[model samples]
Target: GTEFARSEGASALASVNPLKTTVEEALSRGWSVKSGTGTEDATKKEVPLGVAADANKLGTIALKPDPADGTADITLTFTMGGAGPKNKGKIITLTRTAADGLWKCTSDQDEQFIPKGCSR
Candidate 1:
């Protein structure tokens, strides 16, 4: 079930990734599997940590699941075009939710910014 959960989380994350597309495209992906207080209004403009609208280059998308709980630890590593480190980022944890009983991204913290700042 952990593997399944991890995959689901990855899917949810992928949907939100814009890649070469527009940044809003990445933000729109959350509509399918995202909710709770984490769904802040600002997230509609940009994705926290790594996946950005410009300059930043997304590299790896790794997800680690916890068998004991409904927690999905995902690390979206990316390369910065600005004055930052290489292949750096942090994990975006998505815990399993009730009611929907889905692997939706439930936890999102807004610590990072766009353009120039921390990677993860």
Candidate 2:
């Protein structure tokens, strides 16, 4: 599962619009993205922006756009491993935005796993 997450992370950063393109690519790779202001809000809707994962994978992704500066806050969570208490995984969070006409990772808590060129 770690390998899969790493692969997806790399794919997301390779695009021009990291949030939009990553969500699209993630769907094809078995991940999902669900967005809403809050659970109580009637405006909540499951937009098919592309990141939505299927039930089998038990994974989810969220993209929050900072429209003011074209930046996006992304959260990726998934469960992996065989059915047992020993199998658990971590979540990945990242901030991606445009830089020099290309999408780059501005910051991430997972410095070791984050894509190349992303600042700490």
Candidate 3:
């Protein structure tokens, strides 16, 4: 059920670059961390984190879901920081592949991004 919802959300998020803000809203709604393929950490805990996409400052960002199971597989890309010299731009792509409704972050190497700079 959660994964299904995540899948749907991923699809919607893919089209919209500002979906990062939406992600924060979802987390506030009780959505767990992101879990699935291409994860930086597989054995990390699930936590709500703030997501923001500011192309003006962080470049462009894109999110997508897998054609199968709707897990975020491909088409998701995040460009962070500025695009100028020393851009410091960082990219992170998320896929919905985590089973058991767990969301992993950092390519399955670290836990979900803990909620920060948000109200509790």
Candidate 4:
């Protein structure tokens, strides 16, 4: 998500309607651009060290959208590689920020273990 603001009367964006458009508009104009992807690794049968127990499920994600503004959100997920069955999950959260028609992300929070297991 992003926020865009320009001089009220600028020829560069004369044909654009600001109030009716979102920061995404600037993206269409090729002003600001940000690209990336969230991913994990579970290709190997054996898990590595420090894996979180809460990450049993192959795909688990938690996203927290900004309350005051919809410009960004906090996303959390697991990355594979751990030692024991309990150490199969890793939580990673990204701080999603949007500005001037561009969206960027940074590593915000990470939890080594949480609890995601089924009882025998």
Best by TM-score: 2
Which runs of model 1 end up more than 4 angstroms from their true locations?
1-57, 64-87, 98-100, 103-120
lDDT of 1 by residue, 3-119 (tens): 233333333345344321322233345422221113324434323333323332332333222111212333222222222232123234333343343333322323332222122
Model 3: per-residue Cα lDDT over 41-69, one tens digit each: 33443332224334233345544431222
RMSD of 2: 9.4
- Model 2 residue 7 CA deviation in Å: 4.4
Model 4: CA > 4 A from native: 1-56, 66-69, 79-89, 100-120
Error of 3 at 14 (Å): 17
TM-score for each of the candidates:
0.23, 0.32, 0.30, 0.25
Q: Write the per-residue lDDT of candidate 4 for residues 1-120, one digit (tens) a residue.
A: 121111111211121112113323422443321212222223322112222323333323332431113344322223333222333342333333444433332221122232222011
Which candidate comes out best when scored by lDDT? 2
In angstroms, give how far residue 69 of model 1 lies from its true place: 14
For model 2, the stretches where C-alpha displacement exceeds 4 angstroms are 1-18, 21-47, 53-58, 65-91, 94-110
What total of clashing residue pairs does each candidate reach? 0, 7, 19, 7
Please, what is the whole-model Cα lDDT of each candidate in the order they appear?
A: 0.30, 0.39, 0.35, 0.27
Candidate 2 steric clashes? 7
Question: Which lDDT tens digits does candidate 2 get at residues 1-120?
Answer: 324545544544443234546454533444444542222222432234433333324224445541122323443333232112222243334443334223334433255555566555
